[PDB]
Design a protein around this ligand. Structure first.
Ligand SMILES: CCc1cc(-c2n[nH]c(C(=O)O)c2-c2ccc3c(c2)OCO3)c(O)cc1O
Length: 210
């Protein structure tokens, strides 16, 4: 397979390193932030459909599924939102893009708490509070399915995805750190959704393992 490797823009690499090295204890915020991103992407495709019905030809269901897998030590968050083209995937996760990253990095100096990370438009990276590696698989109506992945360290890879086709949307696979497996426990995931997410205008379904 063809794999491209990219460097994160410096400020994002710096942010990632701060997140990976922190003992910040309220790590459950990652779920609120990823669900929020899914909801924003769901809003995007749904808006586009008001004007163009064929936008949902790739899938009419608009929802978010949470899939813990204890055997694989992964928690997967899948949404059927607008997805990302390859260019937007690289831009949105590899650079400051539209975010307040610089202000956030100053806010951290000033000693603010990273729970404000989502208000600075960089909530995705909180995933690194709980994951050693994150894979993002995405399919936008205007492009092919791509898999982005990073274990931090300053780089990430993007490759065309040969996995199960998603009709449209984004799937985030969190390869959890050894000491963060509480997020694969059904009781914990339920408790967290309600505290940081029962505000979302889309169905959020937790798949219980058999
Ligand atoms: C990896 C982060 C993430 C992104 C998306 C997503 N899909 N499409 C888009 C889009 O704007 O086109 C996004 C998305 C959602 C929130 C964002 C974002 C992209 O960049 C900053 O904040 C998503 O649906 C879920 C996610 O967790």
């Amino acid at each position: 397979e063809e794999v491209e490797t990219f460097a994160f823009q410096a400020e994002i690499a710096q942010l990632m390193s701060l997140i990976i090295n922190t003992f910040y204890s309220n790590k459950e915020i990652f779920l609120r932030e990823l669900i929020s991103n899914s909801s924003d992407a769901l809003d995007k495709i749904r808006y586009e459909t008001l004007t163009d019905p064929s936008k949902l030809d790739s899938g009419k269901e608009l929802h978010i599924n949470l899939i813990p897998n204890k055997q694989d030590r992964t928690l997967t968050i899948v949404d059927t939102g607008i997805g990302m083209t390859k260019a937007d995937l690289i831009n949105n996760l590899g650079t400051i893009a539209k975010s307040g990253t610089k202000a956030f990095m100053e806010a951290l100096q000033a000693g603010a708490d990273i729970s404000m990370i989502g208000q600075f438009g960089v909530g995705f990276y909180s995933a690194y509070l709980v994951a050693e590696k994150v894979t993002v698989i995405t399919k936008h109506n205007d492009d092919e399915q791509y898999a982005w992945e990073s274990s931090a360290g300053g780089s990430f890879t993007v490759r065309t995805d040969t996995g199960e086709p998603m009709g449209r949307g984004t799937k985030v696979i969190l390869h959890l750190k050894e000491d963060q497996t509480e997020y694969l426990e059904e009781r914990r995931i339920k408790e967290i959704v309600k505290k940081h997410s029962q505000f979302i205008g889309y169905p959020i379904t937790l798949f219980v393992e058999k």
